[PDB]
Amino acid sequence: LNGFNFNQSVVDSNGRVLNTWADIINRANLGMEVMHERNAHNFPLDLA
Amino acid sequence: KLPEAYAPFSPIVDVLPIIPVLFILLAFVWQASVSFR
Amino acid sequence: SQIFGVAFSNKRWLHFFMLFVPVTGLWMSALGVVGLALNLRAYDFVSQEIRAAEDPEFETFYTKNILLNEGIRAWMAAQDQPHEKLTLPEEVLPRGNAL
Amino acid sequence: VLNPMWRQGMFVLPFLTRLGVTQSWGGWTISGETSSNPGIWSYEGAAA
Amino acid sequence: MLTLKIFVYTVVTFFVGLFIFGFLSNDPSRNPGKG
Amino acid sequence: AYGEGANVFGRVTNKSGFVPYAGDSFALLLPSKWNPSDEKEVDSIVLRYADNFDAVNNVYVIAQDTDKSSIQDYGSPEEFISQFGYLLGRQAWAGQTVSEGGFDANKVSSAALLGVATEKDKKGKTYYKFEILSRTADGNEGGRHQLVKATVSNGKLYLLKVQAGDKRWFKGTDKECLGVLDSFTVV
Amino acid sequence: SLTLILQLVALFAVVAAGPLVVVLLSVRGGNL
Amino acid sequence: MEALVYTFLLIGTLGIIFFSIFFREPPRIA
Amino acid sequence: LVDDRMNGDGTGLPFGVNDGILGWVIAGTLGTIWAIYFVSQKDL
Amino acid sequence: GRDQETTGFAWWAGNARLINLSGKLLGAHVAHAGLIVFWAGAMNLFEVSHFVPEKPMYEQGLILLPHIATLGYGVGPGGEVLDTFPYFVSGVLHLISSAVLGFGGVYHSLIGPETLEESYPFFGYVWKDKNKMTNILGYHLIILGCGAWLLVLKALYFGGVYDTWAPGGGDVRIISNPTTNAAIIFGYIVKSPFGGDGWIVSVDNLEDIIGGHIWIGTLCILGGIWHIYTTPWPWARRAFVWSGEAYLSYSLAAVSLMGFTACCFAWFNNTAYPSEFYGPTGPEASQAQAFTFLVRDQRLGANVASAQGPTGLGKYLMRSPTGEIIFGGETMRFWDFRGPWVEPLRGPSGLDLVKLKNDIQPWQERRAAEYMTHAPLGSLNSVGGVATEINAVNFVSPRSWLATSHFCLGFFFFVGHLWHAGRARAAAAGFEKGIDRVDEPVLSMRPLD
Amino acid sequence: LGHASFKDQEGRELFVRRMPTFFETFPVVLIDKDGVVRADVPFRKAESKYSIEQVGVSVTFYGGELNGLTFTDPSTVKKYARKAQLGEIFEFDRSTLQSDGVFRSSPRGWFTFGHLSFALLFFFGHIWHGSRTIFRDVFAGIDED
Amino acid sequence: LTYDELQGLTYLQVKGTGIANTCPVVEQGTSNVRELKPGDYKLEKFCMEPTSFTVKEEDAKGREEFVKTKLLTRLTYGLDGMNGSMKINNDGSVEFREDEGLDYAATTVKLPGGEYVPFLFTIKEFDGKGTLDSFSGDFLVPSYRGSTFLDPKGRGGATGYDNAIALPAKADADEIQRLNNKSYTPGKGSAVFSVAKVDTETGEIAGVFESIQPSDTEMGAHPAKDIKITGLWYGQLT
Numbered sequence A: 001l002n003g004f005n006f007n008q009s010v011v012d013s014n015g016r017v018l019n020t021w022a023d024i025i026n027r028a029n030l031g032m033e034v035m036h037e038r039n040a041h042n043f044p045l046d047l048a
Numbered sequence B: 001k002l003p004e005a006y007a008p009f010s011p012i013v014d015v016l017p018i019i020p021v022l023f024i025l026l027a028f029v030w031q032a033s034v035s036f037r
Numbered sequence C: 001s002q003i004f005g006v007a008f009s010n011k012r013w014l015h016f017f018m019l020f021v022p023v024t025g026l027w028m029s030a031l032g033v034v035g036l037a038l039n040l041r042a043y044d045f046v047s048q049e050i051r052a053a054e055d056p057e058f059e060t061f062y063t064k065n066i067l068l069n070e071g072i073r074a075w076m077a078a079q080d081q082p083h084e085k086l087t088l089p090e091e092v093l094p095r096g097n098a099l
Numbered sequence D: 001v002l003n004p005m006w007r008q009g010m011f012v013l014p015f016l017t018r019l020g021v022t023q024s025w026g027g028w029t030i031s032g033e034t035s036s037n038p039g040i041w042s043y044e045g046a047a048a
Numbered sequence E: 001m002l003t004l005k006i007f008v009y010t011v012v013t014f015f016v017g018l019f020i021f022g023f024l025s026n027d028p029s030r031n032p033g034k035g
Numbered sequence F: 001a002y003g004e005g006a007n008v009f010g011r012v013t014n015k016s017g018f019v020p021y022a023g024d025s026f027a028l029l030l031p032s033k034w035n036p037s038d039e040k041e042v043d044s045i046v047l048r049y050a051d052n053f054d055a056v057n058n059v060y061v062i063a064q065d066t067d068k069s070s071i072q073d074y075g076s077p078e079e080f081i082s083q084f085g086y087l088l089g090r091q092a093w094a095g096q097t098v099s100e101g102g103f104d105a106n107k108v109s110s111a112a113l114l115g116v117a118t119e120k121d122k123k124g125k126t127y128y129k130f131e132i133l134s135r136t137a138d139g140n141e142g143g144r145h146q147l148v149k150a151t152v153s154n155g156k157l158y159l160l161k162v163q164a165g166d167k168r169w170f171k172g173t174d175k176e177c178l179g180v181l182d183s184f185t186v187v
Numbered sequence G: 001s002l003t004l005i006l007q008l009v010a011l012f013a014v015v016a017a018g019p020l021v022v023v024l025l026s027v028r029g030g031n032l
Numbered sequence H: 001m002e003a004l005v006y007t008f009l010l011i012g013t014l015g016i017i018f019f020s021i022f023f024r025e026p027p028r029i030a
Numbered sequence I: 001l002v003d004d005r006m007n008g009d010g011t012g013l014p015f016g017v018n019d020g021i022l023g024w025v026i027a028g029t030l031g032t033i034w035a036i037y038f039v040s041q042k043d044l
Numbered sequence J: 001g002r003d004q005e006t007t008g009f010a011w012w013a014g015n016a017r018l019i020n021l022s023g024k025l026l027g028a029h030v031a032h033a034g035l036i037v038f039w040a041g042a043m044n045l046f047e048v049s050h051f052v053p054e055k056p057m058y059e060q061g062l063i064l065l066p067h068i069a070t071l072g073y074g075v076g077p078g079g080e081v082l083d084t085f086p087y088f089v090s091g092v093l094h095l096i097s098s099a100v101l102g103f104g105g106v107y108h109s110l111i112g113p114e115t116l117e118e119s120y121p122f123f124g125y126v127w128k129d130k131n132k133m134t135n136i137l138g139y140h141l142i143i144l145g146c147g148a149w150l151l152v153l154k155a156l157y158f159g160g161v162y163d164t165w166a167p168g169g170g171d172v173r174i175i176s177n178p179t180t181n182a183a184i185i186f187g188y189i190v191k192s193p194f195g196g197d198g199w200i201v202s203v204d205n206l207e208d209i210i211g212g213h214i215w216i217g218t219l220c221i222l223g224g225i226w227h228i229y230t231t232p233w234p235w236a237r238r239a240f241v242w243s244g245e246a247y248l249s250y251s252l253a254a255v256s257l258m259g260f261t262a263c264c265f266a267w268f269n270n271t272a273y274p275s276e277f278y279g280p281t282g283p284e285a286s287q288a289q290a291f292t293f294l295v296r297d298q299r300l301g302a303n304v305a306s307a308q309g310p311t312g313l314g315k316y317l318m319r320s321p322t323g324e325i326i327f328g329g330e331t332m333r334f335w336d337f338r339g340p341w342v343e344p345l346r347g348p349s350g351l352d353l354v355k356l357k358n359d360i361q362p363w364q365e366r367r368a369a370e371y372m373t374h375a376p377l378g379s380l381n382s383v384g385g386v387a388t389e390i391n392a393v394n395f396v397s398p399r400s401w402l403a404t405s406h407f408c409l410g411f412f413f414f415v416g417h418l419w420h421a422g423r424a425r426a427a428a429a430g431f432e433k434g435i436d437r438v439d440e441p442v443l444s445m446r447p448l449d
Numbered sequence K: 001l002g003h004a005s006f007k008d009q010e011g012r013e014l015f016v017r018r019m020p021t022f023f024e025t026f027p028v029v030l031i032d033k034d035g036v037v038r039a040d041v042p043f044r045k046a047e048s049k050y051s052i053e054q055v056g057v058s059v060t061f062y063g064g065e066l067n068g069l070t071f072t073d074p075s076t077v078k079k080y081a082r083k084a085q086l087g088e089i090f091e092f093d094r095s096t097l098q099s100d101g102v103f104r105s106s107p108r109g110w111f112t113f114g115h116l117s118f119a120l121l122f123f124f125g126h127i128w129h130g131s132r133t134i135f136r137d138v139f140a141g142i143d144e145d
Numbered sequence L: 001l002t003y004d005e006l007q008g009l010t011y012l013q014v015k016g017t018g019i020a021n022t023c024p025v026v027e028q029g030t031s032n033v034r035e036l037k038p039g040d041y042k043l044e045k046f047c048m049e050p051t052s053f054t055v056k057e058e059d060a061k062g063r064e065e066f067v068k069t070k071l072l073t074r075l076t077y078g079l080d081g082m083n084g085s086m087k088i089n090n091d092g093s094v095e096f097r098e099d100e101g102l103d104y105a106a107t108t109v110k111l112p113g114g115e116y117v118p119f120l121f122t123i124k125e126f127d128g129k130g131t132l133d134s135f136s137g138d139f140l141v142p143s144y145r146g147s148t149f150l151d152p153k154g155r156g157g158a159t160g161y162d163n164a165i166a167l168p169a170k171a172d173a174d175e176i177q178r179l180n181n182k183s184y185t186p187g188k189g190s191a192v193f194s195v196a197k198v199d200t201e202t203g204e205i206a207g208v209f210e211s212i213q214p215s216d217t218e219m220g221a222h223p224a225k226d227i228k229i230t231g232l233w234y235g236q237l238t
């Protein structure tokens, strides 16, 4: 069930993706997931 | 969705789940009204 | 004494020890952050990197953690440090397979 | 052959090998012969 | 190789049987209190 | 700055998720979920937009000076994309290999053509439309979807190239990539 | 909309019924 | 020499724990 | 096959029993403890 | 109610002030029955209200319309919702039952008899009347056997309940010849709880489920008659502590156990918890990843039987820990999967590569909504899938949610069992309020060293 | 060695992005005169137009040991890009001191680390002795008052 | 267990018993072997499981010997689901050639003493020339890993760093074996077969085999060793 997913949460009038501390944590988390199991993934989404 | 005969009552339906949570909170009002005896 | 083997026998020692443990822990971690202030970090275990360099078969959770730290650095500093103008392309940013 | 054990200052290993143990947990044998299974009685096993 | 399985199953049932009959065996009266 | 009040009960002005762009004789609806990036793979790239989530989902256009008057003068669309088989990325590994699995010998990446079109918008010049699934031995993103719309107006070929990983393509960037594809117009 | 207005008035009626009961029992005697 | 150092410190600390558990000073004042 | 394996992993074995001798010794151990407890019940 | 200084318990222990008041116990209990039935009826009304019929029914945040739909009440052949009137009438009947139950509960709490045995010997009880406790257990067990036999009546004589394993993608099927045999039912209850078999999450077919319901209904009814017509044995009365607090501890431990069980049921079952109505479980959507990718690259032209991945095992297929061929993704931890779209693709020895190449079915192919979205990710705040996925879809899997709510609350009920177990044992001993301050067991027995 | 000067295939001066203090490992990218990315050592090595062997950069040098031998073909250009990504390129002998390869700390760093830690520890010492001095009556004894 | 009775078992009965790893056999057939009718055959379902795994090692005294080993791999070693052909004449010469299927298997085994030897049990691109009694040939042997495989330092071949990320002052002419080569040149191995227990009515042959194939070269850092595999194979002729 994870925690809070606060990425893409703040937008402007034109709808641009406005960066946030949550987006900093999000990019850190995905930079964590890219080395997570370098060769044990054959398929894009991580479910198993 | 609700059937046609019950469609106008859907906003009245749309407030029920908080009532059980209000029951324990009413018990808290009870316990404060008896001044925690 | 019958559960854990050893027990407190003087409550002065008990309460002094429970005063002691958090103050000691915070002071030692403060000295650690003092160390990190000058970019002195406990990063490498030179024997571990040497043997992992000469042998592509040896690895540890430590080695996984070091490589994962490189991932955190590369994918986060790009927007975390705006003054660095880090326009690093995606093919130099490192990946696993399929992710 | 050309870097024999007695050239390495081996003091207690010759006395180990004189009564039977020749190979350790490292997968090597001092005679150079293909590694068998020591059992519990290897150099390091006897040491422990 | 199943001999290890038989031995460990026997000792596990032994310890579990000690537990089961130990708590079946009038356990709440093992108290210094008046009860 | 000037003082103007808050927006209370004043609705929202943007819900389609697309912003307009007007350039040097070209117009397209760039995604508002994407932001520009000065990542010029080819020196002929004039405009580029990339997703803030995953920059693999990126779009760019070029203005390459040419000699052919019409895109039909380039011949068949297969022979056209065989001419432009250098924007997909040539492998830097020349080592011999066969253990890639489901790929050609001594090769790492392969591209699958999944669509051809000669669509027409306002004047009569035909829009060469393609959809390329780029499969790699890495398997990153489960592949990438390459959608290319290229036409020539006067003497410059205007080649749209939106990129989309096969993961986000299934997640729902299909609608936005198709919107950019149908909005890439040359006036 | 009218749906929101009905939702809010029903919300107020169902939240204020309980304290009304305890206050009525406090002012109409006791045994609560 | 690396591994036996770690082994010795670990089993030594476990020995001090064992000795403190069973061969401690008997407790006084409560 | 290159080695002799138990080959009972899964297959819905009740209590993980694959040969009858294991169930018999389980019942024997429980019955032995039960006989000891029953004959030595009522404290005395 | 009453005050602290006479009951001995503070306000935050006030529900124990009615331990020795059977009438107030009845009032609180009937009021609680009203609360549970009220939540059931209300939520069934909401899940009727918030329904989108064209979508599959698991992305709307609905937990118990799958409970009605598992009974097959308004379910199409492939799984189409068809109608919502049975769900509506279920919710309204629950709401009316809640009103009558709540009225009875407040009546027995306020104006109901304060103590029960002075006027109703059939309803009054001291907490050492072991025979009448066994009578109450007999009554309740007869009720539970009646409920199980009610499910029997629905499965065999009322033409309901959906089987996911019917050919073509399942069907609502009236169950004929259910498997009630003691060998399979008991082997289903005494096996390992791990991925090799699964202890109680292993029921692959509804004949097996309904035969288990035969067994539980018959056993509860016969044990109800037994508990009514028998007296506790000396061994039971010595081993057990008989007080209302110990009874709480037993009930709390049991209900925590079945809570943990219900959590695992929701997490893994696709038979008694249809995936078409609940969303995919853990092993699926990942089996769906591997299945969609295998069919897609065998469609483009790349072979999969000779296709080898990065690590030497296979990008699209490998061999399982047992000699069967399984799917080659990272779903190789889920090789024990059984979902309605793999058995027609399941061969005895292997995965039957020629069957994969040719005998592929388009319902299996179109079973990609489980793959693409709806995997049992979903975050605390909705959003998409994995923790890095962005605000694109609003979904969470009800399987995940009513698994974690149940297991968390079952853990808290394990803690409550521990609390009342210890307090009941200490009170039956005589030191629930502490040590007697003048004659401690400490000073009476020998020092350690 | 000298200043590693990198040219593209058509001819323009690329500059190596230097490695800041925070980073144990920084990517090696050759960026344009203005500040555009033109080449990099790739991780995937299978996409785009930034890999060295197809961009065509050449390393020249203008310094002491190496002054006029330009390298363009082999992995020597990647090796010198990696070396110049740390600053100026130097030869080091690592056999005299059995030298390892990881970066050690300066005597300034050791001095400042030791003295900041000691200054904060002596803050504890000062606050403790101030406590003991101000509170000498309650540390020693008050005798039931 | 002949293939006819294997198909009649449900997927649950085989699950967890390991009989799927067992290749089908022939009991009603004959051992005449040369009796088989010549011509051209287009057979399917090459089943191939091993029975032993012995690894060749080199002593530093000059003789050739083999030794038994112990498998770290569980039941993933058989080959199942290929198709191919042989061109048989009256005398007995064949033209055996596989085409495509599960023609590889990841396996890890240790010699006595404790040395990891992983290998890819492949039979792919096998040409079969010779009589039914003994026909041999050569088969392509892939490396083991794809070129996208990563070492724990993150370096590699087609993708990776191919440089000393862990220690920045080591790039001289010493890590060439570890950094610069990264060879994935596929080797070649020899497998000798024998056809036994021939079937006349439905065309089923199930013999034994002995296959010489090199082990894994890992990343090319250390030379490969030879592993001989003895086992039993199966195929149905159509």
Ligand code: CLA
Pocket: D008, D009, D010, D011
């Ligand atoms: C009679 C027992 C005995 C024998 C025959 C040997 C023999 C040997 N040992 Mg050894 N060793 C021993 C006991 C012994 N050791 C013990 C008890 C220990 C534990 C402390 C060690 C620890 C040890 C180590 C760590 C090493 C050796 C090594 C060696 C080999 C190298 C030669 C050498 O010893 O250096 C020189 C021999 C001498 C200098 C002889 C000393 C003669 C007298 C006693 C000196 C006078 C001392 C003086 C009175 C005191 C003032 C000293 C003060 C100013 C500091 C050699 C074959 C080396 C080796 O091969 O590695 C495996 C090695 O590095 N040994």
Ligand code: CLA
Pocket: D012, D013, D015, D016, D018, D019, D046
């Ligand atoms: C379970 C008991 C046991 C066993 C099986 C071993 C086994 C071994 N020990 Mg060991 N040892 C032991 C106990 C044991 N030890 C104990 C308790 C100690 C502490 C005192 C030692 C201290 C020790 C040391 C210091 C060393 C060994 C060594 C060795 C190894 C080689 C011995 C050798 O070849 O030298 C030869 C042994 C002898 C020549 C002994 C001869 C006995 C004399 C000649 C007896 C003479 C008087 C006698 C009473 C007369 C008999 C009368 C007759 C008429 C019957 C060997 C594997 C050596 C080694 O390699 O390290 C591992 C070595 O350096 N041990």
Ligand code: CLA
Pocket: B024, B026, B027, B028, B030, B031, G021, G025, G031, G032, J001, J002, J003, J010, J011, J012, J013, J014, J015, J016, J017, J018, J021, J024, J025, J027, J028, J029, J031, J032, J099, J102, J103, J106, J109, J110
């Ligand atoms: C599951 C919820 C629940 C239930 C069913 C009960 C039930 C009961 N509690 Mg209790 N209690 C609860 C939660 C609950 N409690 C909580 C959370 C606390 C901690 C604050 C307490 C603390 C507490 C104390 C300290 C005491 C009780 C007592 C009692 C008993 C008598 C109460 C009474 O007569 O005064 C009357 C209560 C009120 C006048 C306020 C409630 C308002 C009405 C009755 C209910 C709400 C209206 C509702 C819509 C009516 C339905 C109408 C119908 C037609 C639909 C009773 C059987 C007493 C006891 O133990 O008996 C000796 C006692 O002293 N409780």
Ligand code: CLA
Pocket: J137, J141, J189, J190, J219, J220, J221, J222, J223, J224, J226, J230, J231, J232, J233, J236
């Ligand atoms: C939830 C309903 C319920 C409850 C609360 C009770 C409660 C009780 N029953 Mg009872 N019973 C029930 C249902 C229930 N029963 C049903 C449905 C039947 C019909 C089959 C019976 C038939 C029955 C009989 C014949 C007897 C009791 C007895 C008893 C009393 C002693 C408990 C005991 O034997 O210790 C604990 C028991 C054990 C430790 C041994 C049980 C054997 C194992 C655990 C069962 C085998 C299944 C499997 C291996 C378990 C693994 C799965 C599990 C982990 C979930 C007790 C108060 C005894 C009695 O009447 O007292 C006078 C008595 O002899 N019951």
Ligand code: CLA
Pocket: J039, J063, J064, J067, J071, J147, J150, J154, J255, J256, J258, J259, J260, J262, J263, J266, J402, J406, J409, J410, J413
């Ligand atoms: C805030 C508290 C809370 C809430 C909101 C819920 C909510 C829910 N729980 Mg739950 N639970 C809780 C606390 C809670 N629980 C606690 C503390 C525990 C102990 C740890 C449990 C243990 C638990 C278990 C074991 C189960 C649930 C289940 C459920 C779900 C279905 C409820 C149900 O049908 O029950 C059952 C209602 C009855 C037993 C009484 C009615 C008898 C039946 C329905 C009669 C049959 C009628 C027939 C089917 C239809 C009529 C047809 C006609 C012909 C007669 C539901 C969403 C179930 C689940 O996981 O989903 C499948 C389930 O198995 N819970």
Ligand code: CLA
Pocket: J011, J012, J013, J014, J015, J016, J248, J252, J408, J409, J412, J413, J414, J415, J416, J417, J419, J423
């Ligand atoms: C159906 C199960 C059940 C029942 C019938 C009882 C019954 C009783 N408990 Mg008990 N208990 C239970 C479960 C149960 N408990 C569980 C699961 C726990 C672990 C959390 C406890 C822990 C506990 C303690 C520590 C104590 C009792 C006590 C009591 C007695 C007095 C209760 C009272 O008036 O307090 C008043 C009621 C309240 C103050 C209301 C509490 C409000 C809670 C804390 C808010 C959380 C609600 C929230 C919506 C849920 C969040 C979701 C969850 C996942 C966190 C009473 C007879 C007392 C006692 O020992 O008396 C002898 C006491 O000290 N219980």
Ligand code: CLA
Pocket: K121, K122, K123, K124, K125, K126, K128, K132
């Ligand atoms: C020049 C500064 C200075 C001086 C003169 C003193 C003097 C004194 N301190 Mg004090 N203190 C200081 C700084 C100082 N302290 C600092 C910086 C701290 C923070 C860590 C403290 C924290 C402190 C505490 C908590 C206590 C004292 C106490 C005392 C008194 C007796 C303790 C003693 O010395 O026995 C001998 C000390 C030891 C045997 C310590 C063991 C040796 C240590 C662990 C390692 C030594 C390493 C090496 C030899 C030297 C490295 C240190 C150096 C480079 C700075 C004593 C009069 C005690 C007191 O207040 O009296 C009531 C008391 O308990 N001090």
Ligand SMILES: CCCCCCCCCCCCCCCC(=O)OC[C@H](COP(=O)(O)OC[C@@H](O)CO)OC(=O)CCCCCCCCCCCCCCC
Pocket: C003, C004, C005, C006, C007, C008, C009, C010, C013, H010, H013, H014, H017, H020, H021, H027, H028
């Ligand atoms: C089956 C039983 C399960 C328990 C077995 C394991 C229990 C371990 C025993 C605790 C450690 C004993 C500490 C000795 C030190 C010791 O006994 O001090 C002695 C002290 C007792 O002091 P007194 O009360 O006697 O002090 C008053 C005196 O001044 C007057 O006599 O013990 C305590 O303070 C309470 C116990 C704290 C325990 C601290 C935990 C230490 C963690 C150890 C971690 C080791 C590293 C990892 C392992 C390699």
Ligand SMILES: CC1=C(/C=C/C(C)=C/C=C/C(C)=C/C=C/C=C(C)/C=C/C=C(C)/C=C/C2=C(C)CCCC2(C)C)C(C)(C)CCC1
Pocket: E019, E020, E021, E023, E024, E025, J185, J188, J189, J200, J203, J208, J209, J210, J211, J212, J213, J215, J216, J239, J240
């Ligand atoms: C419906 C169903 C089914 C069926 C089921 C069943 C049939 C079940 C059962 C079951 C059973 C048949 C159970 C039983 C049990 C028992 C138990 C669970 C127990 C117990 C107890 C305890 C734990 C104890 C404790 C103790 C001791 C130790 C001794 C003394 C006393 C005391 C208390 C202390 C199936 C799956 C098929 C299908 C689906 C669903």
Ligand SMILES: CC1=C(/C=C/C(C)=C\C=C\C(C)=C\C=C\C=C(C)\C=C\C=C(C)\C=C\C2=C(C)CCCC2(C)C)C(C)(C)CCC1
Pocket: B006, B009, B012, B013, B023, B024, B026, B027, B030, J031, J032, J034, J035, J038, J092, J095, J096, J098, J099, J101, J102, J103, J105, J106, J109
């Ligand atoms: C005693 C006590 C308590 C408790 C209480 C209670 C528990 C109560 C209740 C009660 C209840 C349990 C109630 C319920 C109910 C229900 C109702 C009242 C209903 C109804 C009806 C109607 C009228 C409906 C209608 C409709 C329909 C039919 C459908 C459509 C829609 C609508 C909604 C319109 C407390 C804790 C406080 C405190 C302490 C003491």
Ligand code: NA
Pocket: A034, A035, A036, A037, A038, A039, A040, A041, C095, C096, C097, C098, C099
């Ligand atoms: Na990866």
